[PDB]
Amino acid sequence: AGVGTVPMTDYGNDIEYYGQVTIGTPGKKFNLDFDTGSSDLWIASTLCTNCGSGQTKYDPNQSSTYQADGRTWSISYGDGSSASGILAKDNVNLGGLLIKGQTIELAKREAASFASGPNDGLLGLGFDTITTVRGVKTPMDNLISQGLISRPIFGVYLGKAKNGGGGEYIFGGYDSTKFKGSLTTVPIDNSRGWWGITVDRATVGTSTVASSFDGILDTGTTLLILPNNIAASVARAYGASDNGDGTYTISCDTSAFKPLVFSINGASFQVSPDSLVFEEFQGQCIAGFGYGNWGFAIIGDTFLKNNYVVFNQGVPEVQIAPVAE
Protein backbone atom coordinates (compact mmCIF):
# COMPACT_ATOMS: atom_id res chain seq x y z
CA ALA A 1 0.00 0.00 0.00
CA GLY A 2 1.14 3.59 -0.56
CA VAL A 3 2.86 5.68 2.10
CA GLY A 4 0.55 6.41 5.06
CA THR A 5 -2.05 3.99 3.67
CA VAL A 6 -3.76 1.67 6.11
CA PRO A 7 -6.17 -1.02 4.84
CA MET A 8 -9.02 -1.64 7.32
CA THR A 9 -10.99 -4.74 8.31
CA ASP A 10 -14.77 -4.44 8.68
CA TYR A 11 -15.82 -6.43 11.73
CA GLY A 12 -19.20 -8.17 11.44
CA ASN A 13 -22.04 -6.15 9.91
CA ASP A 14 -20.17 -2.82 9.86
CA ILE A 15 -19.82 -2.88 13.63
CA GLU A 16 -16.34 -1.35 13.65
CA TYR A 17 -13.20 -1.03 11.51
CA TYR A 18 -9.66 -1.80 12.62
CA GLY A 19 -6.21 -1.51 10.98
CA GLN A 20 -2.75 -2.89 11.77
CA VAL A 21 -0.23 -0.68 13.54
CA THR A 22 3.32 -1.73 14.39
CA ILE A 23 4.57 -0.71 17.85
CA GLY A 24 8.06 -1.18 19.26
CA THR A 25 11.47 -2.32 18.13
CA PRO A 26 11.62 -4.59 16.32
CA GLY A 27 7.84 -4.34 16.76
CA LYS A 28 4.59 -6.25 16.88
CA LYS A 29 1.40 -5.70 14.85
CA PHE A 30 -1.70 -4.63 16.72
CA ASN A 31 -5.23 -4.33 15.40
CA LEU A 32 -6.51 -0.95 16.62
CA ASP A 33 -10.00 0.55 16.24
CA PHE A 34 -9.51 3.97 14.40
CA ASP A 35 -11.61 6.30 16.50
CA THR A 36 -12.37 9.90 15.68
CA GLY A 37 -14.46 10.20 18.89
CA SER A 38 -11.49 9.86 21.32
CA SER A 39 -7.82 10.85 21.53
CA ASP A 40 -5.95 8.21 23.55
CA LEU A 41 -3.78 5.50 21.97
CA TRP A 42 -4.08 2.50 24.33
CA ILE A 43 -3.25 -1.20 23.87
CA ALA A 44 -3.67 -4.48 25.78
CA SER A 45 -0.33 -5.26 27.47
CA THR A 46 1.35 -8.04 29.47
CA LEU A 47 0.63 -5.98 32.61
CA CYS A 48 -3.07 -6.64 31.98
CA THR A 49 -4.92 -8.93 34.37
CA ASN A 50 -8.36 -9.22 32.75
CA CYS A 51 -7.48 -8.92 29.04
CA GLY A 52 -8.68 -11.29 26.28
CA SER A 53 -6.56 -14.39 25.59
CA GLY A 54 -7.11 -13.59 21.93
CA GLN A 55 -5.74 -10.01 22.07
CA THR A 56 -2.17 -9.29 20.97
CA LYS A 57 -0.40 -7.78 24.04
CA TYR A 58 2.35 -5.24 23.99
CA ASP A 59 5.34 -6.50 26.00
CA PRO A 60 7.67 -3.71 27.22
CA ASN A 61 10.47 -6.28 27.67
CA GLN A 62 10.43 -7.13 23.97
CA SER A 63 10.85 -3.56 22.72
CA SER A 64 14.32 -2.07 22.85
CA THR A 65 12.73 1.38 22.47
CA TYR A 66 10.28 1.18 25.40
CA GLN A 67 10.67 4.07 27.85
CA ALA A 68 8.90 3.90 31.24
CA ASP A 69 6.69 6.77 32.42
CA GLY A 70 5.43 7.39 35.94
CA ARG A 71 1.86 8.44 35.01
CA THR A 72 -1.32 6.39 35.06
CA TRP A 73 -4.42 6.78 32.89
CA SER A 74 -8.02 5.75 33.05
CA ILE A 75 -10.71 6.15 30.40
CA SER A 76 -14.46 5.68 30.39
CA TYR A 77 -16.28 5.78 27.09
CA GLY A 78 -19.73 7.01 26.30
CA ASP A 79 -21.01 3.40 26.00
CA GLY A 80 -19.88 2.43 29.53
CA SER A 81 -16.74 0.54 28.44
CA SER A 82 -13.44 1.48 30.12
CA ALA A 83 -9.72 0.72 30.49
CA SER A 84 -6.88 1.93 32.71
CA GLY A 85 -3.14 1.49 33.16
CA ILE A 86 0.17 3.29 32.83
CA LEU A 87 1.81 5.56 30.26
CA ALA A 88 4.90 4.64 28.26
CA LYS A 89 6.78 5.84 25.22
CA ASP A 90 7.73 3.88 22.10
CA ASN A 91 7.72 4.10 18.29
CA VAL A 92 4.55 3.61 16.28
CA ASN A 93 4.48 2.74 12.58
CA LEU A 94 1.31 3.92 10.87
CA GLY A 95 1.25 2.72 7.24
CA GLY A 96 5.00 3.18 6.84
CA LEU A 97 5.18 6.46 8.83
CA LEU A 98 7.39 5.90 11.86
CA ILE A 99 6.27 8.16 14.70
CA LYS A 100 9.17 8.40 17.11
CA GLY A 101 8.49 8.57 20.83
CA GLN A 102 4.72 8.47 20.81
CA THR A 103 3.01 8.33 24.24
CA ILE A 104 1.21 4.95 24.34
CA GLU A 105 -1.10 3.83 27.15
CA LEU A 106 -0.67 0.28 28.34
CA ALA A 107 -3.77 -1.34 29.75
CA LYS A 108 -3.62 -3.07 33.12
CA ARG A 109 -7.41 -3.48 33.19
CA GLU A 110 -10.08 -3.31 30.47
CA ALA A 111 -13.87 -3.86 30.26
CA ALA A 112 -15.05 -7.34 29.21
CA SER A 113 -16.45 -5.86 26.01
CA PHE A 114 -12.88 -5.07 24.98
CA ALA A 115 -11.63 -8.44 26.17
CA SER A 116 -14.11 -10.14 23.84
CA GLY A 117 -13.90 -7.81 20.81
CA PRO A 118 -11.63 -8.05 17.79
CA ASN A 119 -9.09 -5.30 18.53
CA ASP A 120 -5.99 -4.97 20.66
CA GLY A 121 -6.82 -1.36 21.59
CA LEU A 122 -7.76 2.04 20.16
CA LEU A 123 -6.07 4.74 18.10
CA GLY A 124 -7.72 8.08 18.95
CA LEU A 125 -8.12 10.56 16.11
CA GLY A 126 -10.01 13.29 17.99
CA PHE A 127 -8.39 16.61 19.01
CA ASP A 128 -5.69 16.74 21.69
CA THR A 129 -7.94 18.82 23.97
CA ILE A 130 -9.61 15.58 25.07
CA THR A 131 -6.60 13.31 25.72
CA THR A 132 -7.24 11.87 29.23
CA VAL A 133 -3.73 12.86 30.38
CA ARG A 134 -2.77 16.51 29.98
CA GLY A 135 0.26 17.14 27.75
CA VAL A 136 -0.04 14.01 25.59
CA LYS A 137 0.52 14.71 21.92
CA THR A 138 -1.74 12.53 19.74
CA PRO A 139 -0.48 10.52 16.74
CA MET A 140 -1.78 13.23 14.31
CA ASP A 141 -0.01 15.91 16.31
CA ASN A 142 3.25 13.94 15.97
CA LEU A 143 2.78 13.11 12.26
CA ILE A 144 2.56 16.85 11.72
CA SER A 145 5.45 17.96 13.96
CA GLN A 146 7.79 15.18 12.78
CA GLY A 147 7.05 16.19 9.16
CA LEU A 148 5.64 12.74 8.32
CA ILE A 149 2.56 14.22 6.55
CA SER A 150 2.75 17.45 4.54
CA ARG A 151 -0.97 18.24 4.83
CA PRO A 152 -2.71 17.89 8.18
CA ILE A 153 -5.27 15.44 6.80
CA PHE A 154 -6.44 11.84 6.70
CA GLY A 155 -8.89 10.42 4.08
CA VAL A 156 -11.38 7.83 5.29
CA TYR A 157 -13.16 5.08 3.36
CA LEU A 158 -15.27 2.58 5.34
CA GLY A 159 -16.65 -0.30 3.28
CA LYS A 160 -19.98 -2.07 3.61
CA ALA A 161 -20.03 -5.75 4.58
CA LYS A 162 -22.73 -6.21 1.96
CA ASN A 163 -20.15 -5.24 -0.71
CA GLY A 164 -17.16 -7.13 0.71
CA GLY A 165 -16.20 -4.98 3.74
CA GLY A 166 -12.80 -3.36 3.85
CA GLY A 167 -12.04 0.29 4.31
CA GLU A 168 -8.96 2.45 4.01
CA TYR A 169 -7.40 5.34 5.87
CA ILE A 170 -4.75 7.49 4.15
CA PHE A 171 -2.61 9.71 6.39
CA GLY A 172 -1.62 12.89 4.59
CA GLY A 173 -3.68 12.38 1.40
CA TYR A 174 -6.97 11.04 0.01
CA ASP A 175 -8.14 8.71 -2.78
CA SER A 176 -10.61 10.04 -5.39
CA THR A 177 -11.37 6.49 -6.64
CA LYS A 178 -13.44 6.04 -3.45
CA PHE A 179 -15.93 8.88 -4.01
CA LYS A 180 -17.99 10.43 -6.76
CA GLY A 181 -18.20 14.06 -7.85
CA SER A 182 -16.67 17.03 -6.01
CA LEU A 183 -15.83 17.15 -2.31
CA THR A 184 -17.90 19.61 -0.25
CA THR A 185 -15.93 21.59 2.40
CA VAL A 186 -17.65 21.72 5.81
CA PRO A 187 -16.24 23.78 8.69
CA ILE A 188 -15.61 21.92 11.93
CA ASP A 189 -16.31 23.13 15.46
CA ASN A 190 -13.61 21.53 17.66
CA SER A 191 -14.55 23.43 20.82
CA ARG A 192 -15.43 20.14 22.64
CA GLY A 193 -12.47 18.26 21.20
CA TRP A 194 -14.59 16.47 18.61
CA TRP A 195 -15.17 16.73 14.85
CA GLY A 196 -18.40 18.73 15.22
CA ILE A 197 -20.46 19.80 12.25
CA THR A 198 -23.85 21.33 11.65
CA VAL A 199 -26.41 19.43 9.56
CA ASP A 200 -28.83 21.93 7.91
CA ARG A 201 -31.80 19.54 7.77
CA ALA A 202 -32.85 15.93 7.23
CA THR A 203 -35.58 14.78 4.87
CA VAL A 204 -37.18 11.44 3.99
CA GLY A 205 -38.93 11.80 0.61
CA THR A 206 -40.64 15.23 0.77
CA SER A 207 -40.90 15.33 4.57
CA THR A 208 -38.55 17.49 6.63
CA VAL A 209 -37.90 15.18 9.60
CA ALA A 210 -35.40 17.56 11.20
CA SER A 211 -34.17 21.11 11.07
CA SER A 212 -30.51 22.03 11.79
CA PHE A 213 -28.76 20.09 14.50
CA ASP A 214 -25.16 19.59 15.51
CA GLY A 215 -23.41 16.24 15.39
CA ILE A 216 -19.97 14.69 15.73
CA LEU A 217 -18.22 12.60 13.07
CA ASP A 218 -17.41 9.44 14.96
CA THR A 219 -15.78 6.48 13.21
CA GLY A 220 -15.86 4.71 16.61
CA THR A 221 -19.67 4.62 16.85
CA THR A 222 -21.66 2.02 14.95
CA LEU A 223 -25.00 3.80 14.47
CA LEU A 224 -26.44 7.14 13.63
CA ILE A 225 -27.45 8.27 17.16
CA LEU A 226 -29.91 11.16 17.20
CA PRO A 227 -31.42 13.35 19.96
CA ASN A 228 -34.80 11.92 21.09
CA ASN A 229 -37.12 14.25 19.16
CA ILE A 230 -35.16 13.89 15.91
CA ALA A 231 -34.90 10.09 16.24
CA ALA A 232 -38.65 9.89 16.91
CA SER A 233 -39.42 11.96 13.81
CA VAL A 234 -37.14 9.75 11.66
CA ALA A 235 -38.67 6.58 13.10
CA ARG A 236 -42.18 7.81 12.23
CA ALA A 237 -41.10 8.23 8.62
CA TYR A 238 -40.10 4.53 8.36
CA GLY A 239 -42.67 2.93 10.66
CA ALA A 240 -39.83 1.86 13.03
CA SER A 241 -40.80 0.76 16.57
CA ASP A 242 -38.92 1.87 19.70
CA ASN A 243 -37.29 -1.03 21.55
CA GLY A 244 -36.98 1.13 24.69
CA ASP A 245 -33.18 0.61 24.77
CA GLY A 246 -31.92 3.34 22.41
CA THR A 247 -32.67 1.16 19.39
CA TYR A 248 -35.57 0.62 16.97
CA THR A 249 -37.12 -2.36 15.21
CA ILE A 250 -37.57 -1.76 11.52
CA SER A 251 -38.75 -3.76 8.54
CA CYS A 252 -36.04 -6.08 7.21
CA ASP A 253 -37.30 -5.19 3.73
CA THR A 254 -35.75 -1.84 2.76
CA SER A 255 -36.69 -2.12 -0.91
CA ALA A 256 -39.57 0.28 -0.23
CA PHE A 257 -37.68 2.84 1.88
CA LYS A 258 -36.51 6.21 0.69
CA PRO A 259 -33.02 7.31 1.74
CA LEU A 260 -32.43 9.51 4.81
CA VAL A 261 -30.84 12.63 3.25
CA PHE A 262 -28.79 15.17 5.22
CA SER A 263 -28.31 18.66 3.77
CA ILE A 264 -24.82 19.79 4.86
CA ASN A 265 -23.35 23.08 3.72
CA GLY A 266 -25.65 23.05 0.71
CA ALA A 267 -25.04 19.49 -0.54
CA SER A 268 -26.92 16.20 -0.08
CA PHE A 269 -25.45 13.20 1.74
CA GLN A 270 -27.44 10.12 2.47
CA VAL A 271 -27.94 7.00 4.44
CA SER A 272 -28.98 4.60 1.61
CA PRO A 273 -31.96 2.25 2.21
CA ASP A 274 -29.74 -0.79 2.85
CA SER A 275 -27.96 1.14 5.67
CA LEU A 276 -31.28 1.71 7.47
CA VAL A 277 -30.96 -1.91 8.62
CA PHE A 278 -28.04 -2.48 10.99
CA GLU A 279 -28.50 -6.15 11.90
CA GLU A 280 -30.97 -8.99 11.42
CA PHE A 281 -31.48 -11.43 14.30
CA GLN A 282 -33.89 -14.36 14.00
CA GLY A 283 -35.88 -12.45 11.41
CA GLN A 284 -36.16 -9.16 13.34
CA CYS A 285 -34.13 -6.16 12.11
CA ILE A 286 -32.45 -3.47 14.19
CA ALA A 287 -32.39 -0.03 12.53
CA GLY A 288 -29.24 1.81 11.58
CA PHE A 289 -30.34 4.89 13.61
CA GLY A 290 -30.85 5.00 17.40
CA TYR A 291 -31.50 7.64 20.07
CA GLY A 292 -29.63 9.00 23.01
CA ASN A 293 -30.31 11.72 25.51
CA TRP A 294 -27.88 14.32 24.04
CA GLY A 295 -28.60 17.57 22.28
CA PHE A 296 -26.18 16.59 19.51
CA ALA A 297 -26.09 13.61 17.18
CA ILE A 298 -23.32 11.02 16.99
CA ILE A 299 -22.69 10.59 13.25
CA GLY A 300 -21.37 7.02 13.26
CA ASP A 301 -20.58 4.22 10.79
CA THR A 302 -24.17 4.05 9.40
CA PHE A 303 -23.45 7.43 7.83
CA LEU A 304 -19.71 7.15 7.28
CA LYS A 305 -19.92 3.91 5.27
CA ASN A 306 -22.00 5.91 2.73
CA ASN A 307 -19.78 9.05 2.56
CA TYR A 308 -16.04 9.50 2.10
CA VAL A 309 -14.49 12.02 4.51
CA VAL A 310 -11.19 13.92 4.38
CA PHE A 311 -10.46 15.07 7.98
CA ASN A 312 -8.31 18.26 8.15
CA GLN A 313 -7.00 18.83 11.69
CA GLY A 314 -5.24 21.98 10.54
CA VAL A 315 -8.15 24.29 9.72
CA PRO A 316 -10.07 22.40 11.09
CA GLU A 317 -12.55 21.28 8.43
CA VAL A 318 -13.77 18.19 6.59
CA GLN A 319 -14.38 17.47 2.87
CA ILE A 320 -17.21 15.02 2.13
CA ALA A 321 -18.50 13.20 -0.94
CA PRO A 322 -20.83 10.25 -1.49
CA VAL A 323 -19.00 6.89 -1.74
CA ALA A 324 -18.26 5.53 -5.22
CA GLU A 325 -20.37 2.37 -5.40
Partner: peptide, 7 residues
Amino acid sequence: PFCXLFX
Protein backbone atom coordinates in the same frame (compact mmCIF):
# COMPACT_ATOMS: atom_id res chain seq x y z
CA PRO B 1 -22.73 -1.63 18.45
CA PHE B 2 -19.75 0.43 19.73
CA CYS B 3 -19.71 4.00 21.11
CA UNK B 4 -16.17 5.24 21.64
CA LEU B 5 -15.72 9.73 24.80
CA PHE B 6 -19.09 11.49 24.82
CA UNK B 7 -21.84 9.62 23.06
